[PDB]
């Protein structure tokens, strides 16, 4: 009873996961689309407005470019790097923890932590 | 070998340490950092472990070093440990009594600074009326 | 105004310095109705303005 | 007249107003824990010892004077300074005592932190026959180091009673120890946060070292953001000696423990954002395009491009300011995710076979790996092959309809043998064979291993 | 007060239906002509938007149910706070189901010519995308809530004993069957639906 | 269980973590093997009590100081759970402490009849039943001048609905009547609160845990009225709560119960309380049934009754540790295994 | 084909794309800010690392602002019902997704910043839970930015 | 942190000004793009010089 029920659960889980993970790897397309479209619509709102062939060399038309580059760069660094690549990092992390470490990874062990004075 | 593809090869060795060389072998194994001990006497309780009278001592002394760490924030052989635990205890005692003769004196100071103000703010109430 | 002023009257009997703070919060609560008044007066000014 | 805490002034006012029905003039003046003064004016008698049972109950200290408000102030200021000088004496003695202690607490603390650690480990030993027996694990590389360091140490101090170092052949589960350098340490901590592996299992943090930054880069694809992340990682890699001997708070300890996961996450992001044309969401006209636009066309009308060739490395730059470019990028990135997920799963599924082969268990192989392999490959291996085979055929020069692969896998399970748009010759009879090979492994993976473990107990 | 409005709307519907029926005009309340004359893009876009909306309101529902109890149960036993994140993952996959169905549905969303606009196929592929967005968003909603509840129980039974998480992960598997079955049914429903032509 | 973890997600999982610190039967057997109160302290230090008696150091360690500090950390854990509570949960936490406020009122106004000092009759008071005007119950003797001065602003004010003050000030005979009547009105109000606003899984298993409190209090009032009371049944029926399993047919027979058999034949007709008055310690029967009703209140998951089932089980744990430490300090070990362990 | 009531759906989609997203962001800011204010009265040095849930709730409202701005640049007097209902779908998607993601960030965030003061190992736990709840707003933003690209074709 | 933003303001805006000067089709090639290339390059190159002034001034800090 402890082997037959375990193999039924293993069969249901494996045959579920063969379908459920090949559709869960489509987050590689989801977050790539999100990153590409956010980096497009941030450019189009910040520095596509700063590009104009009128008032070439004017102080207002160059402080426009300076302020819009600063607003673009802090938004790229704050969102599209730190608060977007952290989400991409965590999604590539769960693709390892679930979609890759369930085909071969048992994971029933304990760490080697010896009697050491360099760890107290 | 390296062990990045699979784990390293463990052996489960068995030592026999006599009582003459016991602290020296234990402090050697602490510096070698290679021997992962296993609790053989799991069936024994928290007491009756054999080294419990020497561990409640360094629990108490750990508490005393924690008290010395709180007072500052508030403002080896066996004999070489045995004479330095003496200067831990002999200084914890005087620091505790001098801190307890200081906060209970600050309270007595505030009990007079509160009594001066209720005279200053109630002579003024009579001088107004 | 009501749910500030009840607490301000409960509080300004204990602390006399809380009364000015009560008046100032009630001014910020009454300027909301003043803003509604301004929007409706500017709106009612255009009700019959060149309407055929 | 007295003192009171400020949080009890209103409740003392209410209790005295409910005790004396009216009959009082109660004031309060803040003393500048926070406190407060009070004056009552108990107009009358017979409750004067009962007001004091209200005041002294909730810790109010009445100050009766009865002589003068200028004679007690002198006798009280003659005690304030007289006791403030005792404060200035004892606190000076305190700060004198703390000088010899503040520069000595890292020795007294570090003695106890390891002495308690010695006795906690000595509780784990046997104490059988006036001698402790220490049983525990050590890697096989460090056996001769123990037998050469324990042997030299017991002889150099005299005390002629030698230790006995045996090696016990046992069967309980040994610890796992992966020897990681500074490159593979962060991946090992990342993969051991989820689950500690069993003894001599295949390490999952040794395929992580490339695939985790690469599956990151598929989601984070841009040469501009990728170069920024690579640069702020290479700043930590080149300065790893000044940052190692430094106190790291938890966020920067997380960022500096993985200074080599971020270098690879930037280095792959530059590669994949050179595969895309995405440099801060712009294109790169590096190579020759496979699409040419017509030369003579009216302004503002919708035009198509004629295919000249194929773009050499990466996606093509004539899809940038394009109305239907996002449809093509959806198709490409969806099939990219399908094929890379298929590759990652069929790569990590072979490690199970290597595990069952190292355990020398053919029962586990024939019960789990083979019915898993020809179930996974017969459905989604066929899907990943069909994507490549649709990319291989032209479907316009051949004047054939391009098959839909979603409703091909829908109709492979619902209506077998019926192929509306033919994708290859012999499709309708090979998909039945693949369907039967997938459906035969649902009872086989469920019934092989228990019925052959039951047969090996007879 | 909401029961008063539920009774008032019911009384107004009954009075309007009986007034329209008694006066010989009862076929003027015509739901079939309402279905024939409303635009198919309403049903299609509403189905896509409710698919990706109601998958996410079930995914985010389950995420807080098995997140708040994971953090509460991790105060005494902090060795669950990384292993037990698969209960967040199982209730998070029901949002990627609705996302990859909403994009496949929005691929079938083109501009139909006005001469054949309320045709058989254009109206069919509005109805199909509407109900196949509903049956995916609602199924992923209910699956996300069920996986969140059975992960919130697992996050506390893990902190009780370590050998219980393996036994109660099976209930999360049987709970996460449901979103995949909705994923299948919503692809079978809009399988024969063509684009807007 | 679909709307529980909005405001009660963190609250339950910590209380469920507090449940795992309940001592099992083996952790009680390891406490009964101790020889000294110091050995019992060191045995408790390996549990989730660890280093709660650290500021004692083996000299001033008595069996009452253990009951002080082990219950004090219960009270601080209850205050930590109550500080993170909001809405109906915080009101449910307040309604638990009202029953301790009643005991502190009835313990504070007996320390003034006997003219015992106010600073020492308050260290015996319960810390969870603290209201800000609790020391000011030492101002009057009669019930009307203690209600109308102090106990109007307290949340115990709706519970003085049947306490008839006939201008007799206070003896020890009517303070127990006021105590039982306040607890009667409190059990009524808290049962109506549980039935009204507490959700359904935490409703049925909390109505049983609260009807058990009512039944135990009914049996204790109807059985303590034999020895130290000579009262009429029409005045005795105002002391018995009417929410429990025992009210409509059996508290009538407990009201006119003039003898011990009038109690025993009344409790023989109820099915789960029969046999309590036959053999054994009756207080142990009630504490055992309390723990068996608190055990199967942890088995329902998304319930705020787990707070009640935790704190009553942790109070029984402190009582068992106090009984063991009383046995191993007075050197009596004939009934050291009289603890109650269902965990 | 392009009726007179067709820019109702686009204008109400542009409305709902910021309304529902700001409701979700307000719940995620307020409920997780109560946990910050309750936590940082006994341990105030955790004040600027517990600030992450209100930042993520602000990122949600930025995701809704992007869709509202990109819908209101495609509105016209004489747009079709195709453009109108596709702007409506682009509004509803990011609206329900930002609302759900903000509710989830609010309910996870206060529990996380309360468990982080008792156990320091729960900071990485609450961040890794809140990152899953953050990208649900991205999962609606994807459908919104895909339906935006099919506005006038 | 202004020196990092200023160094990127030198590099990125100099590359953008060079791509406007040479009439690169990812910046000029559309109808919605600006018509005159060097007219935009003249006002992006001055912003590159302004960020170079910020980089030199904050480089001695």
From Swiss-Prot, chain D:
It is found in: Endosome membrane; Golgi apparatus membrane. Residues 48-98 form a coiled coil. Keywords: Acetylation, Coiled coil, Endosome, Glycoprotein, Golgi apparatus, Hydrogen ion transport, Ion transport, Membrane, Phosphoprotein, Transmembrane, Transmembrane helix, Transport. One of its GO terms (biological process) is Golgi lumen acidification. The chain crosses the membrane at residues 202-220, 223-239, 254-283, 332-351, 370-390, 434-453. Signal peptide: none annotated. Residues 221-222, 284-331, 391-433 are vacuolar. The keyword Ribosomal protein does not apply. It is a multi-pass membrane protein. Residues 240-253, 352-369 are cytoplasmic. One of its GO terms (molecular function) is proton-transporting ATPase activity, rotational mechanism. Its main location: membrane. One of its GO terms (cellular component) is vacuolar proton-transporting V-type ATPase, V0 domain. Subunit of the V0 complex of vacuolar(H+)-ATPase (V-ATPase), a multisubunit enzyme composed of a peripheral complex (V1) that hydrolyzes ATP and a membrane integral complex (V0) that translocates protons. V-ATPase is responsible for acidifying and maintaining the pH of intracellular compartments. Is present only in Golgi- and endosome-residing V-ATPase complexes; enzymes containing this subunit have a 4-fold lower ratio of proton transport to ATP hydrolysis than complexes containing the vacuolar isoform and do not dissociate V1 and V0 in response to glucose depletion. Present with 1084 molecules/cell in log phase SD medium. Belongs to the V-ATPase 116 kDa subunit family. This is V-type proton ATPase subunit a, Golgi isoform. The chain holds residues 241 to 707 of 890 of the full protein.
From Swiss-Prot, chain E:
This is V-type proton ATPase subunit c''. It is found in: Vacuole membrane. Residues 67-84, 150-167 are vacuolar. Residues 20-45, 106-128, 189-197 are cytoplasmic. One of its GO terms (cellular component) is proton-transporting V-type ATPase complex. V-ATPase is a heteromultimeric enzyme composed of a peripheral catalytic V1 complex (components A to H) attached to an integral membrane V0 proton pore complex (components: a, c, c', c'', d, e, f and VOA1). The decameric c-ring forms the proton-conducting pore, and is composed of eight proteolipid subunits c, one subunit c' and one subunit c''. It comes from Saccharomyces cerevisiae (strain ATCC 204508 / S288c) (Baker's yeast). Proton-conducting pore forming subunit of the V0 complex of vacuolar(H+)-ATPase (V-ATPase), a multisubunit enzyme composed of a peripheral complex (V1) that hydrolyzes ATP and a membrane integral complex (V0) that translocates protons. V-ATPase is responsible for acidifying and maintaining the pH of intracellular compartments. Belongs to the V-ATPase proteolipid subunit family. It comes from the Eukaryota. Keywords: Hydrogen ion transport, Ion transport, Membrane, Transmembrane, Transmembrane helix, Transport, Vacuole. The chain crosses the membrane at residues 1-19, 46-66, 85-105, 129-149, 168-188.
UniProtKB/Swiss-Prot annotation, chain F:
It is a peripheral membrane protein. Its main location: membrane. GO terms for molecular function: proton-transporting ATPase activity, rotational mechanism. One of its GO terms (biological process) is proton transmembrane transport. GO terms for cellular component: fungal-type vacuole membrane; Golgi membrane; proton-transporting V-type ATPase complex; vacuolar proton-transporting V-type ATPase complex; vacuolar proton-transporting V-type ATPase, V0 domain. The keyword Membrane applies. Subunit of the V0 complex of vacuolar(H+)-ATPase (V-ATPase), a multisubunit enzyme composed of a peripheral complex (V1) that hydrolyzes ATP and a membrane integral complex (V0) that translocates protons. V-ATPase is responsible for acidifying and maintaining the pH of intracellular compartments. This subunit is a non-integral membrane component of the membrane pore domain and is required for proper assembly of the V0 sector. Might be involved in the regulated assembly of V1 subunits onto the membrane sector or alternatively may prevent the passage of protons through V0 pores. This is V-type proton ATPase subunit d. It comes from the Eukaryota. SUPFAM superfamilies: V-type ATP synthase subunit C. The lineage of its organism: Eukaryota, Fungi, Dikarya, Ascomycota, Saccharomycotina.
From Swiss-Prot, chain H:
One of its GO terms (molecular function) is RNA endonuclease activity. Its main location: endoplasmic reticulum. It is a multi-pass membrane protein. Residues 21-43 are cytoplasmic. One of its GO terms (biological process) is vacuolar acidification. It is found in: Endoplasmic reticulum membrane; Vacuole membrane. The chain crosses the membrane at residues 1-20, 44-61. One of its GO terms (cellular component) is vacuolar proton-transporting V-type ATPase complex. The keyword Cell membrane does not apply. Keywords: Endoplasmic reticulum, Membrane, Transmembrane, Transmembrane helix, Vacuole. Accessory component of the V0 complex of vacuolar(H+)-ATPase (V-ATPase), a multisubunit enzyme composed of a peripheral complex (V1) that hydrolyzes ATP and a membrane integral complex (V0) that translocates protons. V-ATPase is responsible for acidifying and maintaining the pH of intracellular compartments. V-ATPase is a heteromultimeric enzyme composed of a peripheral catalytic V1 complex (components A to H) attached to an integral membrane V0 proton pore complex (components: a, c, c', c'', d, e, f and VOA1). This is V-type proton ATPase subunit f. The lineage of its organism: Eukaryota, Fungi, Dikarya, Ascomycota, Saccharomycotina. The chain holds residues 12 to 72 of 85 of the full protein.
